[PDB]
Amino acid sequence: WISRPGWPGHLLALAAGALTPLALAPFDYWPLAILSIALLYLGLRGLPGKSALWRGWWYGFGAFGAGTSWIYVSIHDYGAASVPLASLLMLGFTAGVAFFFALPAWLWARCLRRDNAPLGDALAFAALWLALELFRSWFLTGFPWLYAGYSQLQGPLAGLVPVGGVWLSSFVIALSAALLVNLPRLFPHGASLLLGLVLLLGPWAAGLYLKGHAWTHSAGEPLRVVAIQGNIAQEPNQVRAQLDLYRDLSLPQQDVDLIVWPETAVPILQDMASGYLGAMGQVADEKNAALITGVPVRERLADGKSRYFNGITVVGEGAGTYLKQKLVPFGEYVPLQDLLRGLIASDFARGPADQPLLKAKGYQIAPYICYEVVYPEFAAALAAQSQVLLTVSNDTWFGTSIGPLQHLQMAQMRALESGRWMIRATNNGVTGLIDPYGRIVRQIPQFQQGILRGEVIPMQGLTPYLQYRVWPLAGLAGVLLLWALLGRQLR
């Protein structure tokens, strides 16, 4: 009755979708990520296109409702919203984002093969799953949240994360879930049962063997890191209060190499901060350290106009000013403003792709501002030809609940995916250091005014995911989606 249309199967997909947060942020129970995909694969078995779109919608409604439930905290606290209004707004987002799972489930019903399902279909569902995750990361601005692959960060597939990224982890989980469903119709046939076990067990044996493997060389003697966070919340009179606070926590520090300040640590633009940032560079020079801080960067145009960017700059022992490439749709700009800005009755602009890295202490550092970390293909380009990873972010916008913890799990994955140390400096949310294996070595408690002291090692060499990015896996997926497309076309 699970695979037959109507409500009984719809409501199973809700609870199946709702198991996504359990496999991910604090809980990290990875087996539940396999149940979610298996119950959806079995739930879609016999459905026509008319009701298969709604099973996928009811699965995404459960996944994004429970998994992104932190969004309700953002609407309530920082959106000045009452409980019934915030329940409605969160319900409007969840129902819209739930179509990321509705479309592929509908298209699945038109690529789905039950007759040869035992093997061809399990491979085809993994290919369909990788395709919808890749679709999520781009479609409008992208919504790369709740990927199945992040479940295995501390699990047995952590050896495949450096090989294939979060993509390969999600591919194996989707393949393994669909194979279990097809397993009882396998064993009567010895040949297909043996091949099904190599497809099921093969990647998990390879993942455990490759766990903790060092793909990246040691690049030199470690840099001593100092990260400053401060609890600024919704605050121009207090500009001088912030400049004093960040400086006063840096000056007593000694035996330092890197000093890292989170997103918009200096609230004034770097044009008006030239005297302050030069004075902080001299403070950094006598410590023989570099000061890496976020600042808004303004570009004067040829007209009487200005172009504002969300930047990160380095003074003292390092150089370069990086601008944020990809932004948040209604937080940092207005999409289709000539239309939607007349209906909104918001600031920044996009940064260039030809940007260089940030040089500090002679090493290269790949900057990431806010959630640019959640985009796996974009981060891999910066992580390559970079010795150290650094992310400068402001997590107060998410809220007090799960936002930073899910976001931090994605930042650990990028370090595991590149085999690089990451310096995560946040204004309120989790600040810490992450080793090449995705582990959190040092972290200061959130929602407090702390200082973090640590050591990161620059990393040389390269990771198989940084060499061949998702193309080889996405190519295999396109072939697996063709054999399913032509297998139905030929019948």
Residue numbers in the entry: 3 to 237, 242 to 351, 358 to 503
Give sentences from the paper.
Accordingly, a structure of Lnt from this opportunistic human pathogen (LntPae) was selected for investigation. Because so much was known about Lnt from E. coli (LntEco), it too was included in the study. The two proteins have 39% sequence identity. The LntPae structure and that of an inactive Cys387Ala mutant of LntEco were solved by molecular replacement using the native LntEco structure as the search model. The two structures are remarkably similar with RMSD values over 501 residues of 1.2 Å. Despite having different residues in the active site pocket, the catalytic triad residues superpose almost exactly on one another consistent with the two enzymes catalysing the same N-acyltransferase reaction with similar substrates. The fatty acids of the phospholipids are predominantly 16 and 18 carbons long. These similarities in membrane lipid composition help rationalize the near structural identity of the two enzymes. Sequence alignment shows LntEco to have an heptapeptide motif, YSYESAD (Tyr325-Asp331), that is absent in LntPae. To likewise investigate the head group specificity of LntPae, a lipopeptide band shift assay was performed with LntPae, and with DOPE, DOPG or DOPC as acyl donors. However, transfer rate dropped significantly with PG and PC. Qualitatively therefore, LntPae and LntEco share a similar head group specificity.
